[PDB]
Amino acid sequence: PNITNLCPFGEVFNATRFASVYAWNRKRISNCVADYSVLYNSASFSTFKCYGVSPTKLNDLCFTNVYADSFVIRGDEVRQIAPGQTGKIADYNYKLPDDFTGCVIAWNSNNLDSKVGGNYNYLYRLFRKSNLKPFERDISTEIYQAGSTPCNGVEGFNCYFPLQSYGFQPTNGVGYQPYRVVVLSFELLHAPATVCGPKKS
Amino acid sequence: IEEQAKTFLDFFNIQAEDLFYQSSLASWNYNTNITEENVQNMNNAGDKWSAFLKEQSTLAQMYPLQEIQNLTVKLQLQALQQNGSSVLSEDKSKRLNTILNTMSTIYSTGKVCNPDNPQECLLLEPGLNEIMANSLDYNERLWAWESWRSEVGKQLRPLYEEYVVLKNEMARANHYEDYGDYWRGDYEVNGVDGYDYSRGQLIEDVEHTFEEIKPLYEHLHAYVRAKLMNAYPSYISPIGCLPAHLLGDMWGRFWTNLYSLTVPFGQKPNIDVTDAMVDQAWDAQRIFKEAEKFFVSVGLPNMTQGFWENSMLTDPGNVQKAVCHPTAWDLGKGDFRILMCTKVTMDDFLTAHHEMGHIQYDMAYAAQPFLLRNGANEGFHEAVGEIMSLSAATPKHLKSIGLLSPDFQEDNETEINFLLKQALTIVGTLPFTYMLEKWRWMVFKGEIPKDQWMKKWWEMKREIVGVVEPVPHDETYCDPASLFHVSNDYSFIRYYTRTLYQFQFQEALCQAAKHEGPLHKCDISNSTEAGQKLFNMLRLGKSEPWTLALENVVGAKNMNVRPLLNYFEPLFTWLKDQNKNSFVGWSTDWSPYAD
Ligand SMILES: *[C@@H]1O[C@H](CO)[C@@H](O)[C@H](O)[C@H]1NC(C)=O
Ligand SMILES: *[C@@H]1O[C@H](CO)[C@@H](O)[C@H](O)[C@H]1NC(C)=O
Ligand SMILES: *[C@@H]1O[C@H](CO)[C@@H](O)[C@H](O)[C@H]1NC(C)=O
Ligand SMILES: *[C@@H]1O[C@H](CO)[C@@H](O)[C@H](O)[C@H]1NC(C)=O
Ligand SMILES: *[C@@H]1O[C@H](CO)[C@@H](O)[C@H](O)[C@H]1NC(C)=O
Ligand SMILES: *[C@@H]1O[C@H](CO)[C@@H](O)[C@H](O)[C@H]1NC(C)=O
Ligand SMILES: *[C@@H]1O[C@H](CO)[C@@H](O)[C@H](O)[C@H]1NC(C)=O
Numbered sequence A: 001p002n003i004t005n006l007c008p009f010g011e012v013f014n015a016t017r018f019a020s021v022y023a024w025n026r027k028r029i030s031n032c033v034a035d036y037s038v039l040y041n042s043a044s045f046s047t048f049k050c051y052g053v054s055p056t057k058l059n060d061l062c063f064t065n066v067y068a069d070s071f072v073i074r075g076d077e078v079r080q081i082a083p084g085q086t087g088k089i090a091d092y093n094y095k096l097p098d099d100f101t102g103c104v105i106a107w108n109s110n111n112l113d114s115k116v117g118g119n120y121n122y123l124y125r126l127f128r129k130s131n132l133k134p135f136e137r138d139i140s141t142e143i144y145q146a147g148s149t150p151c152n153g154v155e156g157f158n159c160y161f162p163l164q165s166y167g168f169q170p171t172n173g174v175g176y177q178p179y180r181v182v183v184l185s186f187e188l189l190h191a192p193a194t195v196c197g198p199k200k201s
Numbered sequence B: 001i002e003e004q005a006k007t008f009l010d011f012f013n014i015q016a017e018d019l020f021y022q023s024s025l026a027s028w029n030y031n032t033n034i035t036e037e038n039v040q041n042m043n044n045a046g047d048k049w050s051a052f053l054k055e056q057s058t059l060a061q062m063y064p065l066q067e068i069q070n071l072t073v074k075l076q077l078q079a080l081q082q083n084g085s086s087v088l089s090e091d092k093s094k095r096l097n098t099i100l101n102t103m104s105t106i107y108s109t110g111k112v113c114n115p116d117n118p119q120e121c122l123l124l125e126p127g128l129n130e131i132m133a134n135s136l137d138y139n140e141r142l143w144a145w146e147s148w149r150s151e152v153g154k155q156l157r158p159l160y161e162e163y164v165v166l167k168n169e170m171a172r173a174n175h176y177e178d179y180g181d182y183w184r185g186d187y188e189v190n191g192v193d194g195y196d197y198s199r200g201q202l203i204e205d206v207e208h209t210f211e212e213i214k215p216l217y218e219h220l221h222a223y224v225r226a227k228l229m230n231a232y233p234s235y236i237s238p239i240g241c242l243p244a245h246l247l248g249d250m251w252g253r254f255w256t257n258l259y260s261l262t263v264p265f266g267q268k269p270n271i272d273v274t275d276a277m278v279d280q281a282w283d284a285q286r287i288f289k290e291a292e293k294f295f296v297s298v299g300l301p302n303m304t305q306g307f308w309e310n311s312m313l314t315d316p317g318n319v320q321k322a323v324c325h326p327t328a329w330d331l332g333k334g335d336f337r338i339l340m341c342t343k344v345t346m347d348d349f350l351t352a353h354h355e356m357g358h359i360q361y362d363m364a365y366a367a368q369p370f371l372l373r374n375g376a377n378e379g380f381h382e383a384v385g386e387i388m389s390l391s392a393a394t395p396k397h398l399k400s401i402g403l404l405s406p407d408f409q410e411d412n413e414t415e416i417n418f419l420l421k422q423a424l425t426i427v428g429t430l431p432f433t434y435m436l437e438k439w440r441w442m443v444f445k446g447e448i449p450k451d452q453w454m455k456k457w458w459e460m461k462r463e464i465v466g467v468v469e470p471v472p473h474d475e476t477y478c479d480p481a482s483l484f485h486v487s488n489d490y491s492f493i494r495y496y497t498r499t500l501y502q503f504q505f506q507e508a509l510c511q512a513a514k515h516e517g518p519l520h521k522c523d524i525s526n527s528t529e530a531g532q533k534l535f536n537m538l539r540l541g542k543s544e545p546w547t548l549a550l551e552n553v554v555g556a557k558n559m560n561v562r563p564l565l566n567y568f569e570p571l572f573t574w575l576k577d578q579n580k581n582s583f584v585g586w587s588t589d590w591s592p593y594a595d
Helices: A075-080 A088-092 B002-032 B036-062 B071-080 B090-108 B124-134 B138-173 B179-187 B200-228 B256-262 B274-279 B284-297 B305-310 B346-364 B380-393 B395-400 B412-445 B450-465 B494-512 B528-538 B546-554 B562-578
Strands: A025-029 A047-050 A065-074 A103-108 A123-125 A163-165 A178-187 B111-113 B121-123 B327-330 B336-339
Touching: A065 A075, A075 A088, A075 A178, A088 A123, B002 B036, B002 B071, B002 B327, B002 B336, B036 B071, B090 B138, B111 B138, B121 B124, B124 B138, B124 B256, B138 B179, B138 B412, B179 B200, B179 B412, B200 B256, B200 B412, B200 B494, B200 B562, B256 B412, B274 B346, B284 B346, B284 B380, B305 B336, B327 B346, B336 B346, B346 B380, B346 B528, B380 B395, B380 B494, B412 B450, B412 B494, B412 B562, B494 B528, B494 B546, B494 B562, B528 B546
Parallel strands: none
Antiparallel strands: A025 A065, A047 A103, A065 A178, A103 A178, A123 A163, B111 B121, B327 B336
């Protein structure tokens, strides 16, 4: 029982920079034996919820396609990263399917992402003409027309730039603090390639 | 259409949260360390915040209020659509701001000079207030009192007149009959199926409720007069108005400083536990933690980490000037804090409960949309803070938390001393608030001609309050402007309405708590039913009519005095026998300068 490639989860979770939620990252995971128990028992997450296979039961399965979606959101938006949810993020920045097979993991990054004077680097979409499909990413930035008068790509009465920044500051209360979110999406497809849990003696 | 306004308010709330936070944080920084740098930063943040509000109130006019059916949009938008003083021409606007700053300046440079040694000047804060609170020399008290109306009062008179005119033009431009009518809009409710309230009803309710409490006041007056005559013999008439300068302060607003002369049973000890705090080595943290427990015990949330980590709970670390005057803060973005340079004393114990009560109200409505994040009306915020303090003060509480000895014997005489102190603090101020607002409203409405302003003031102080000012001042004076709120543009009626809301709340919650005795012996800290009952209202902010907020907490759609009377009924019962051998009420023909 030797140790093989375990997949670069370190680059998923303890990555330096995270994406804006409106333009979330999509990272492919493959060709390895991945231990998920070690994320669960790290006790380093505020949120660790599965809609699919339990956090330590993932270790008894093989998947062919594992994807890690990642981004930064406000703490009060953490509850929206789930199947069946609606809201500013769930409706048009990032949406999980009602039949999602994976797990959503999140943690407080106030000491990493908040800045004195305000961290305005992270963006979310405030407006979209329609809601996103599950796992859809839309990073187009035309000026959003709210009114009936045709808007010629110019901010004005009833016409708004669709993306707005956050303003993360060290003394924001909980819920206005930034959170780093990783979503692990699991698929079983048909290819000579897997992501497996560990062998037991 | 509502749809476009909805989109707009969502966009507005996303901007407003950040700019308000920057401004609030800049003001906070100033208040914890007074220095020019922080002044410059709060002033700059304040100006871009006002500029933002003006740009948004301009955009807001393109969303006709009448097309919006939902209240959360209609109310937030109506709040944003007010044009304020922008309705005034550029010259009238800058002139009014100049006047307001000038009036604040005259009051603020609050000094008078003593003819005994003209180069020696007194300030209002130390000095004149110290004389009015502690000296028993009729003549010293009289000079100090007059010197404030002369000097500061007289200097303000010509500004006050221009002020009234400019404010009425502004109010009319915004479709109010006058500025008093503008202020009364804070209690106005419309289009809510019976929870509606017309601005003119504030006057009817204030006048009605006032008449109903006069008997408590008349007996308090007679009792106090009987006692002050032994401090100021010859000077006070047995059947008259008390001279204004003999009431304990510069305006005759509180009768609290007279307590030491009027103490019912001077042979009995008080419940001032400060010595216990000293023997038990309590510090500021203990004081705030006991206050936190009060709130936790009733079912309210605990304080946030930001509160415990960032608050100025003690004197500043270096020899710094800071605004130590106690106050709660809400910066936006869930950042809650307090400023209070706490000393180990019962007064700060009670203050900590008062301000934390304000924080709990701010936390409860934190989830409301930004323009609705305030109390139901101007008197609600303080009414909540006052009930938390009132409960913390009872001997029942104090002995239960190990602060007052468990062997303390509370009896009839103790209860009376307690209630009189409270009456001097509460009952004795209602006619002041009532009289002042009634007078200012008549001034703003144009009912009192500019050359009859002091004439009416003096007559009303004798007929309503029962106090006679010792000097027959001319119309060159503006004695009401000698008070902070009058010269600095504040409404005052909030104190009248707050007091009555306070007692209605205390009664409703003591009933929820199943208290079995009189209201002054009530402690609701162990009642989670009372906690939830109040909470359900606190969480609403301004999203609902204040009249509904009262139905939810007290079972009423309006204010009442019966709970005030019930709180003090046993004091009253006692006063009724104390005055059986004397005149109750007062004559207004007598004055201390009559001859
Ligand atoms: C977390 O950070 C630590 C730092 O040593 C690193 O070793 C680890 O691989 C990172 N990632 C995870 C998923 O623990
Ligand atoms: C004084 O206010 C300034 C604002 O820059 C702050 O940086 C400084 O630490 C404060 N001084 C003290 C002694 O708190
Ligand atoms: C106000 O907004 C709320 C949002 O849930 C909506 O339910 C309510 O119906 C709106 N008011 C009216 C009168 O439509
Ligand atoms: C303020 O709003 C009112 C609402 O009708 C409008 O009539 C008035 O002209 C506006 N004033 C300014 C200064 O924009
Ligand atoms: C607040 O947190 C403290 C931490 O121990 C807890 O003991 C207390 O009961 C909490 N209060 C509430 C209302 O949850
Ligand atoms: C003391 O208690 C007795 C009980 O009968 C009561 O009659 C008496 O009036 C009380 N004393 C005072 C000052 O109220
Ligand atoms: C009421 O006081 C008792 C006295 O110890 C205390 O134990 C109890 O916890 C208090 N009630 C609540 C809800 O904390």
